[PDB]
Amino acid sequence: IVGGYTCGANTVPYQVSLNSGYHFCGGSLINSQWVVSAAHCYKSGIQVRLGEDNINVVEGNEQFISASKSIVHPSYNSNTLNNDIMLIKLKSAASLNSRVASISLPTSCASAGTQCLISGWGNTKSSGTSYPDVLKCLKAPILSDSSCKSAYPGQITSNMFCAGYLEGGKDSCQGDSGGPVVCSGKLQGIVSWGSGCAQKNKPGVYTKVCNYVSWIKQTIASN
Ligand SMILES: NC(=[NH2+])c1ccc2[nH]c(-c3ncccc3[O-])nc2c1
Numbered sequence: 001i002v003g004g005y006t007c008g009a010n011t012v013p014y015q016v017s018l019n020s021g022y023h024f025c026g027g028s029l030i031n032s033q034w035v036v037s038a039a040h041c042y043k044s045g046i047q048v049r050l051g052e053d054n055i056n057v058v059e060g061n062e063q064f065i066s067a068s069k070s071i072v073h074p075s076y077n078s079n080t081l082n083n084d085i086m087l088i089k090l091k092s093a094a095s096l097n098s099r100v101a102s103i104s105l106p107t108s109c110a111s112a113g114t115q116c117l118i119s120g121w122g123n124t125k126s127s128g129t130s131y132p133d134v135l136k137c138l139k140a141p142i143l144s145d146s147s148c149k150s151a152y153p154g155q156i157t158s159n160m161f162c163a164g165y166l167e168g169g170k171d172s173c174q175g176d177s178g179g180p181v182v183c184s185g186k187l188q189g190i191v192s193w194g195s196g197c198a199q200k201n202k203p204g205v206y207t208k209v210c211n212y213v214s215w216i217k218q219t220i221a222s223n
């Protein structure tokens, strides 16, 4: 997260870290056995880490559970990143409490102007790599579709939305991929891509979760 602040241990109880010997992506807990992340974060050998704050120290509240299966959306395109969403089922359910909690799926899409919270352990520099130990937060608004399409002409599908600051300085970055964009208590986006990090006129692009709620409910219901 570039231009963000330290969230505070366990203030974001639905944030998960996807780990394969190191942190590589974020994700959101939506029920005690399912996590939603981005299809480009897929790999085998994923351990889901819940109740995390400092990812390099065990401090208490952490739950490490291995993933039983990862379901990348059947229509995910790795060249356009359209349908960039993946569901991970956990080997055992997580114990929920106030430090580990699920986030709700939306009942409607959000409008531009809505302010949202983006969090993650990804890069905090736009030029160079500086990964934090603790979780960083950034509050960003959803931009209008014209500013998003004018920024990435021909690269935005209707399953993507832009959120961020056109003046630059604040944005999500690598390491944040797969993580949450929560607005008014609902999971509205997933960190998917952007051109560099925090660059002027290059806002972040997120998977528009409101378009996958029926798919998520049907896939969890049949697995
Ligand atoms: N500007 C953003 N909001 C953003 C978000 C996620 C990213 N992930 C990446 C990224 N991911 C994997 C390898 C290199 C990257 O620059 N760039 C990213 C940029």
Ligand SMILES: [Ca+2]
Pocket (backbone or CB within 6 Å): 052, 053, 054, 055, 056, 057, 058, 059, 062
């Ligand atoms: Ca820790």
